[PDB]
């Protein structure tokens, strides 16, 4: 006899701002315009620095994480999409586990969406306060209570704005999902920036262009040893390399090739003779969502571990979760987990590190593949994309497989969809690991996310067109 | 060995099913791959170009706002 969790949250939902759904079906060009405007606002927020940060050259523990989360350090998007993803993951997992029973009624669905939003906002407030109190922007006593409050308010408002923009796009004002568009844009921007950045970084020997292409051209023009300068550009230790860019291009092509793999099931309209369609079961049936869920879970684990280590030094549980050390080895400060579970979860930086610590690399690979396969299987059940649900969608669409009853369709789909999901998740994890080992610019996870998001946006665009 | 069999049999079935899936997967035709790659490249170029320009414009703004 549990009082409904949604009923408990219902009074708070009224305070939550909710975007009105469009009364009229929006024109395709107008949807494109809305998507462009929302993206432009998101990019501006991504570039605007937070007010009152004290300039600390403190290590970035989350540099790999920020690219996936569409977060930029020291900006209004420092939190990025992490609260929204975390709240979605938690609420979906609770629904799948049946701890929270969501009724089919619109009131229950509306409450479920409001609860997920409310959790996202609560997480945004908690994370912003946590980041201010952890000294990421400087010591709280030195910054002062007023600055800390201002930063917390700014982060909360930025997260709320992002949540509203995502709602606006999802509700059909724009194309696709705002979270997906933001992630894809962030990754594309980061890769293009590293390729073409004109900024000069003062390496101890000399001022070196950050952008791999610009540095290559400058070195070739300025150096008598053109071959040596080219080799240095290919194998630079401190800045993005041309070889890394080539590796990224190779990964991008490989990912597209695997993305194209599909199993075509012949479907006929039962009502109308001669209409032949194929239902494509893609190899990556579950999309980037297994990656997103795995990365969000790992990100939350890292945040919790770094907080526990900062606040409760020397406790056995804290050491088990993670020990962080800031390694300023001739580079911008980076906080690496040197012990605990977080160390095993962290990607090895190079083949050399894999050779030095083979156990860590094996554990990381096994964890990534297992987690991706598990998340893919769970996601299909939670998402309503199971063979039964697809068969229901086909019955609603009056599409019937030739010679097979609608019940038969479920059995045939059930043969492929679970296998496709688990194998696709394993393949995605393997591709991510391979790209990370190859050192592709923008990260193996980032490149996979960008390619698949772009492909799904292109499919949406073609379908609408 | 029963515990080992209990772990091996699901994995062995999974490998067999994966082989079946790959065997029935239609591999993309070269024209289809080229079309997909071109569309993805265009989307990547557009988003990266917009982000790069926005960042470049903000950097002088962010050096006046924060630098001083």
């Amino acid at each position: 006899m549990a009082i409904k969790f949604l009923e408990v949250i219902k009074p708070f939902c009224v305070i939550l701002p909710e975007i009105q759904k469009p009364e009229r079906k929006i024109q395709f060009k107008e949807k494109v315009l809305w998507t462009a405007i929302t993206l432009f606002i998101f990019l501006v927020c991504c570039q605007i620095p937070l007010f009152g940060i004290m300039s600390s050259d403190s290590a970035d523990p989350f540099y790999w994480m920020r690219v996936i989360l569409a977060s930029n350090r020291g900006t209004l998007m420092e939190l990025g999409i992490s609260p929204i993803v975390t709240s979605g993951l938690i609420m979906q997992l609770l629904a799948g586990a049946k701890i929270i029973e969501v009724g089919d009624t619109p009131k229950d669905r509306a409450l479920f969406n409001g609860a997920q939003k409310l959790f996202g906002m609560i997480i945004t407030i908690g994370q912003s306060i946590v980041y201010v109190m952890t000294g990421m922007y400087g010591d709280p006593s030195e910054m002062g209570a007023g600055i800390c409050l201002l930063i917390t308010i700014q982060l909360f408002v930025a997260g709320l704005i992002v949540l509203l923009l995502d709602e606006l796009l999802q509700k059909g004002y724009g194309l696709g999902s705002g979270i997906s568009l933001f992630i894809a844009t962030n990754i594309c921007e980061t890769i293009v920036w590293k390729a073409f950045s004109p900024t000069t970084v003062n390496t101890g020997r000399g001022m070196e262009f950050e952008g791999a292409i610009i540095a290559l051209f400058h070195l070739l023009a300025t150096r008598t040893d053109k071959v040596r300068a080219l080799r240095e550009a290919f194998y630079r230790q401190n800045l993005p390399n041309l070889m890394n860019l080539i590796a990224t291009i190779f990964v991008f092509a490989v990912v597209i090739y695997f993305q194209g793999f599909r199993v075509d099931l012949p479907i006929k309209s039962a009502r109308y003779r001669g209409q032949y369609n194929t239902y494509p079961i893609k190899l990556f049936y579950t999309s980037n969502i297994p990656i997103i869920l795995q990365s969000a879970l790992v990100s939350n684990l890292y945040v919790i571990s770094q907080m526990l280590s900062a606040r409760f030094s020397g406790n056995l549980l804290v050491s088990l979760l993670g020990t962080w050390s800031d390694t300023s080895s001739g580079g911008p400060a980076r906080a690496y987990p040197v012990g605990g579970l977080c160390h095993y979860l962290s990607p090895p930086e190079s083949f050399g590190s894999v050779l030095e610590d083979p156990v860590h690399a094996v554990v990381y690979i096994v964890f990534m593949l297992g987690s991706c396969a598990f998340f893919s299987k769970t996601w299909i059940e939670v998402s309503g994309s199971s063979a039964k649900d697809v068969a229901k969608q086909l019955k609603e669409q009056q599409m019937v497989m030739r010679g097979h009853r609608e019940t038969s369709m479920v059995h045939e789909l059930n043969r492929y969809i679970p296998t496709a999901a688990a194998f696709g998740g394993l393949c995605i994890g393997a591709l991510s690991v391979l790209a990370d080992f190859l050192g592709a610019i923008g990260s193996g996870t980032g490149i996979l996310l960008a390619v698949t998001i772009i492909y799904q946006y292109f499919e949406i665009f073609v379908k609408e067109q | 060995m029963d515990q080992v069999m209990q772990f091996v049999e699901p994995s062995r079935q999974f490998v067999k099913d994966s082989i079946r899936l790959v065997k029935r997967c239609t591999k993309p035709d070269r024209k289809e791959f080229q079309k997909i790659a071109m569309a993805t490249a265009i989307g990547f170029a557009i988003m990266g170009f917009i982000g790069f320009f926005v960042k470049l414009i903000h950097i002088p703004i962010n050096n006046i706002i924060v630098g001083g």
Partner: peptide
């Protein structure tokens, strides 16, 4: 809340952050 109000609120917040930066510079100077 309408989409246009959401956009207006986002733009106002961005402008407010810029104003806060300007005021902070004036107070420091």
């Amino acid at each position: 809340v309408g989409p246009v109000p959401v956009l207006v609120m986002s733009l106002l917040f961005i402008a407010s952050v810029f104003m806060l930066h300007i005021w902070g510079k004036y107070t420091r100077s």
